[PDB]
């Protein structure tokens, strides 16, 4: 009881993003140890404790905050769109978990449209399923369907003419006059409701048969590309260009912070289909600036792509605990991983102390300085916390 | 009574033309005696006649008659030409002329259906195939009743046609659902005006809960290039419930600082769209659109680049220097950007890049015509001067 007394530490934290249908509801959980055992308190962004809301928000045993299923008219912003957090506290101090973003989605409007595409014979074609920005978080392309129905799904066989890219576009090798008679519909899936539906629009291709030579041209919006992909996932890099004769596509990666570039090596992991680079099992080193060089006899063109491979954020403090004599300095170092890293910030007993560096330093330790210390690592998506304790010697 | 050649009329940097229309480039130069005009390639070699394809007119213009698509020849129809003018006193070459013939090709405009949250502005775009993209643009938009929407200086209305050709729509309500919009494009080579068979539609949605401002990944970064004196627009494509506020800033170069954009007669803002007329080179820079509502935020980066036509001049236009005394040439030029400066003597590159060229001692060999050339990845310009002997 008195032996091995510790400040609190989180065993289990909720994930950064909690997104759920009003029909599904949600449950988040928080666990922490310590001696004495800490009390768990669900808090709001302003630091105040959240209470029960009938039929909407419920605090239960085992430190679980529950959001039951609810009618559309029952939607409440103060409940269903909010950032929560877990507060663990005992006599030695307080720690706050990473931000928990709770968003309930009441089932609503969405639909996909497919832009028609004029393509020169022999060139590759790309059909895109365009999804509204406000549903794009929960809605992505599952597959494609031709006029006969035949279902086209993503795969590792790149040898076929029809290929669904990791990003969801339908890629078609070496178009020909027959392809003009085919029409395609994209099937999208809502990850919250598990619902799937076909686009009302049918993607078409108009195949042009030029005699006179046409030089490579990239539409201005395709000239620069910015792609974000999760670590270990699969992804593709488009180079959108048409020419007669059909052009060649060469992919290079710039050496960071220089104008020099090296050709991208094709292997089991990295494949190239026409102008498209297809990469499975993303790695941290893939991140960087890429260049696609397009050439035919009459002219040439280029596409610049900035790739960012995101990795989950994690944080740790060295030491997890230390005992410092009065008057002597105390230093805390926040070790973190994940990509990208925007900020690093420090906290003491649930209060931001206004220090932005991985190293927190207390010049002269006093009574008031003892307690729990945290560092938070954040980016536009994820947050991660680490905790440590300062004791007086 | 005696003069070296100088160009009165030079061809433009770019000549684009349809195989149906053909094209004609003109070069005129003044000198005593009258200089002969010779057409050459980029490599400096003389161009010959190709029957039905490349010809010289009665007044000495290089002619590209209309031709069958099967008669397309790259050496003729994709080429960089130049005009060489000379007399007994020397030679001068005009700026590069990029000649590109374009065989008429089938094309059409499609319009993506736009889902819009009630109260938000909407932007409809006329999507054009890449191979006609340089030669085809939107001159207007037409609703279901045939009412023509033209770009205007009145920004207070419901509809606004932006310089880039998009149809901007203020504060979309569900009452706008029944309407349709078609773009009327213009082919500058063939002069053909045509109406899109596709009809742009707005689908209006009313969200149950609040919505954070959201920008599609491809709209997060934007890049705009515009010529001097020309009007343009900077889009911030974002939607939120309730409707958001749009704040435009401009970064101070080489810093994280930013200054808010100053709206005036020249610079006006419609919803989240920044619209500017009479572009100036100073407008060039990196901009930031910040979007806000009660429930969240979002941003859009835009790199703007304004270019100016290249022009060149040499001071003095002509000079006579005694044997042994130095001669000085200074190249005055304008336009943006300037990538390279190169000089020339009597049609031959002398390998000097500076705005100033000075001979320390004039010899009888130094007698002749001198030129300086300003260049970038698109445009080129020249200036000529004569040197005599005293
Ligand atoms: C979260 O919020 C969403 C959005 O408001 C709710 O979803 C709606 O729920 C209602 C009620 O269940 C759905 O109503 C539909 O009613 C059909 C007929 O029901 C009537 O049957 C007879 C007709 O006279 C009468 O007894 C009486 O009038 C009944 O009301 C059902 O057949 C529907 O079921 C099926 O069809 C729909 C598509 O129409 C499918 O999506 C369903 O999965 C099911 O296969 C349906 O129940 C309404 O359609 C829902 N809208 C949407 C967009 O899904 C959720 O209920 C709410 N979650 C909660 C409350 O937990
Ligand atoms: C209207 O909408 C705009 C756009 O969304 C909002 O502007 C954003 O505001 C947030 C918060 O104010 C900004 O995020 C913050 O940026 C600070 C500066 O970061 C710099 O330094 C780091 C290195 O540490 C670099 O990686 C980075 O590139 C910058 O150079 C951070 O220091 C902040 O972090 C600290 O504060 C937050 C709380 O805000 C803590 O959670 C963190 O742990 C840390 O202690 C913070 O990340 C964001 O950059 C702004 N966006 C833009 C585009 O400027 C407006 O806030 C909004 N208006 C209103 C009224 O809400
Ligand atoms: C295939 O296409 C690529 C891209 O269009 C061509 O590469 C580009 O070549 C141009 C020259 O034709 C380069 O511009 C030049 O740059 C120098 C400065 O380095 C400048 O002094 C010149 O006046 C000219 O503007 C351009 O940088 C280059 N870009 C890339 C990404 O390589 C390539 O030449 C084409 N292949 C063939 C065989 O032509
Ligand atoms: C320049 O090249 C273009 C493209 O090859 C030529 O356009 C083509 O012209 C032929 C007629 O010579 C068109 O065929 C005919 O069209 C009419 C309708 O206009 C139709 O009734 C006939 O049965 C026949 O199909 C062809 O469609 C057209 N193609 C395109 C893409 O426009 C043009 O003639 C060339 N110009 C010159 C001066 O050679």
GROMACS .gro file of C-alpha atoms in nm, chain A residues 17 72 75 77 81 101 106 108-109 111-116 118 120 128 130-134 137 201 208 210-215 217 219 224 226 242 297-298, chain B residues 69-70 72 74 78 100 103 105-108 110-113 115 117 127-131 133-134 205-212 214 216 218 221 223 239 295:
model
   78
   17UNK     CA    1  -1.022   0.887  -3.459
   72UNK     CA    2  -3.110   1.123  -3.660
   75UNK     CA    3  -2.785   1.420  -3.297
   77UNK     CA    4  -2.296   1.841  -3.141
   81UNK     CA    5  -1.888   1.604  -3.259
  101UNK     CA    6  -1.189   1.266  -3.187
  106UNK     CA    7  -2.594   1.017  -3.937
  108UNK     CA    8  -2.666   1.083  -4.542
  109UNK     CA    9  -2.625   1.194  -4.904
  111UNK     CA   10  -2.291   0.978  -5.489
  112UNK     CA   11  -2.004   0.933  -5.734
  113UNK     CA   12  -1.956   1.075  -6.083
  114UNK     CA   13  -1.722   0.960  -6.360
  115UNK     CA   14  -1.570   1.210  -6.599
  116UNK     CA   15  -1.569   1.100  -6.964
  118UNK     CA   16  -1.094   1.131  -7.473
  120UNK     CA   17  -0.557   0.865  -7.821
  128UNK     CA   18  -1.163   0.810  -6.190
  130UNK     CA   19  -1.504   1.123  -5.814
  131UNK     CA   20  -1.636   1.135  -5.459
  132UNK     CA   21  -1.765   1.440  -5.268
  133UNK     CA   22  -1.508   1.592  -5.032
  134UNK     CA   23  -1.735   1.577  -4.727
  137UNK     CA   24  -1.335   1.013  -4.534
  201UNK     CA   25  -2.288   0.763  -6.406
  208UNK     CA   26  -0.927   0.921  -8.122
  210UNK     CA   27  -0.485   1.090  -8.516
  211UNK     CA   28  -0.248   1.063  -8.812
  212UNK     CA   29  -0.051   1.382  -8.759
  213UNK     CA   30   0.185   1.363  -8.463
  214UNK     CA   31   0.067   1.493  -8.126
  215UNK     CA   32   0.318   1.596  -7.860
  217UNK     CA   33   0.057   1.717  -7.291
  219UNK     CA   34  -0.327   1.892  -6.794
  224UNK     CA   35   0.193   1.862  -5.970
  226UNK     CA   36   0.077   1.530  -5.371
  242UNK     CA   37  -0.105   1.146  -7.404
  297UNK     CA   38   0.966   1.229  -8.113
  298UNK     CA   39   0.779   1.560  -8.140
  462UNK     CA   40  -0.360   1.488  -9.229
  463UNK     CA   41  -0.164   1.217  -9.411
  465UNK     CA   42   0.188   1.579  -9.200
  467UNK     CA   43   0.755   1.677  -8.856
  471UNK     CA   44   0.701   2.069  -8.585
  493UNK     CA   45   0.344   2.377  -8.465
  496UNK     CA   46  -0.430   1.831  -8.739
  498UNK     CA   47  -0.896   1.615  -8.397
  499UNK     CA   48  -1.228   1.504  -8.248
  500UNK     CA   49  -1.291   1.646  -7.901
  501UNK     CA   50  -1.567   1.728  -7.655
  503UNK     CA   51  -1.747   1.697  -7.015
  504UNK     CA   52  -1.872   1.849  -6.689
  505UNK     CA   53  -1.844   1.675  -6.355
  506UNK     CA   54  -2.161   1.676  -6.145
  508UNK     CA   55  -2.230   1.788  -5.490
  510UNK     CA   56  -2.360   2.164  -4.915
  520UNK     CA   57  -1.309   1.950  -6.868
  521UNK     CA   58  -1.125   1.943  -7.199
  522UNK     CA   59  -0.903   1.673  -7.355
  523UNK     CA   60  -0.530   1.734  -7.312
  524UNK     CA   61  -0.447   1.732  -7.684
  526UNK     CA   62  -0.625   2.194  -7.412
  527UNK     CA   63  -0.395   2.469  -7.545
  598UNK     CA   64  -2.721   1.839  -4.971
  599UNK     CA   65  -2.831   1.948  -4.623
  600UNK     CA   66  -2.610   1.783  -4.359
  601UNK     CA   67  -2.764   1.649  -4.038
  602UNK     CA   68  -2.466   1.728  -3.817
  603UNK     CA   69  -2.202   1.997  -3.853
  604UNK     CA   70  -1.928   1.952  -4.112
  605UNK     CA   71  -1.559   2.040  -4.084
  607UNK     CA   72  -1.284   1.983  -4.625
  609UNK     CA   73  -1.001   1.747  -5.185
  611UNK     CA   74  -0.568   1.763  -5.536
  614UNK     CA   75  -0.191   2.267  -5.364
  616UNK     CA   76  -0.017   2.637  -5.933
  632UNK     CA   77  -1.706   2.309  -4.818
  688UNK     CA   78  -1.639   2.345  -3.605
   0.00000   0.00000   0.00000
